[PDB]
Amino acid sequence: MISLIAALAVDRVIGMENAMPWPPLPADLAWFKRNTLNKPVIMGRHTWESIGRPLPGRKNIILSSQPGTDDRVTWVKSVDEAIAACGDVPEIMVIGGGRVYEQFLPKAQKLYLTHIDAEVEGDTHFPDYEPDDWESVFSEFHDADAQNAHSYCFEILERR
Ligand SMILES: NC(=O)c1ccc[n+]([C@@H]2O[C@H](COP(=O)([O-])OP(=O)(O)OC[C@H]3O[C@@H](n4cnc5c(N)ncnc54)[C@H](OP(=O)(O)O)[C@@H]3O)[C@@H](O)[C@H]2O)c1
Numbered sequence: 659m660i661s662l663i664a665a666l667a668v669d670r671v672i673g674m675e676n677a678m679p680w681p682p683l684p685a686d687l688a689w690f691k692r693n694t695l696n697k698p699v700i701m702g703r704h705t706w707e708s709i710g711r712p713l714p715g716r717k718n719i720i721l722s723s724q725p726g727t728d729d730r731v732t733w734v735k736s737v738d739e740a741i742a743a744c745g746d747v748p749e750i751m752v753i754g755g756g757r758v759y760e761q762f763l764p765k766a767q768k769l770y771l772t773h774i775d776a777e778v779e780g781d782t783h784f785p786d787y788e789p790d791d792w793e794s795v796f797s798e799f800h801d802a803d804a805q806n807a808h809s810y811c812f813e814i815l816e817r818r
């Protein structure tokens with residue numbers, strides 16, 4: 659089973675200049691770690707270059723059309739291969755970026771979304787999807803506080 663996890667600002671903005679255009683929200687980073695630990699993660703090369711190091715406790719799988727440049731991770735040249743390299747596991751986590759999210763969306767059964775109340779400019783967006791394909795089953799909104807500079811809402815959607 660394939661899931662996508664992402665944090666989205668207003669208008670589905672997810673990135674700018676290959677970074678994330680808001681301040682780190684530690685509540686959202688904890689949520690990300692909580693929901694990806696001990697699972698395989700699949701990410702595009704540009705996202706790999708943004709994170710800058712293997713996420714620990716996870717099987718890191720990078721998509722690129724070009725041979726790999728780091729043997730701490732697992733490189734693959736196509737979507738099918740990326741799924742194949744995860745093995746027989748309960749849940750594969752796709753961690754972006756925009757182009758990778760768009761390819762995995764039709765295969766996904768679960769979206770893990772953080773809705774952040776920030777109004778920033780971006781160059782990368784989360785893919786358009788069809789609201790009638792999905793069912794919202796968890797929703798948790800929190801206000802901003804001393805550690806988290808925007809209000810945010812965790813949501814999980816399951817494919818109907
Ligand atoms: N807010 C969030 O939750 C979040 C999460 C993740 C990323 N981001 C942001 O998203 C942005 C990056 O997104 P992006 O769309 O530019 O890049 P991306 O999707 O992360 O990476 C695209 C790259 O992945 C490779 N790739 C994708 N599909 C492939 C396929 N089917 N076969 C072989 N290779 C494939 C290609 O690498 P090659 O060029 O080497 O062939 C490619 O150009 C950054 O700003 C990042 O910070 C935000």
Ligand SMILES: Nc1nc(=O)c2nc(CNc3ccc(C(=O)N[C@@H](CCC(=O)O)C(=O)O)cc3)cnc2[nH]1
Nearest residue numbers: 663664665686687688690691709713714753754772
């Ligand atoms: N919900 C969500 N939030 C994000 O920040 C996010 N970011 C990406 C890609 N960017 C990154 C950047 C940093 C880390 C990261 O440092 N995670 C560490 C610790 C985070 C922390 O210090 O709190 C980890 O171990 O998971 C992960 C993904 C993909 N999906 C996301 N999904």
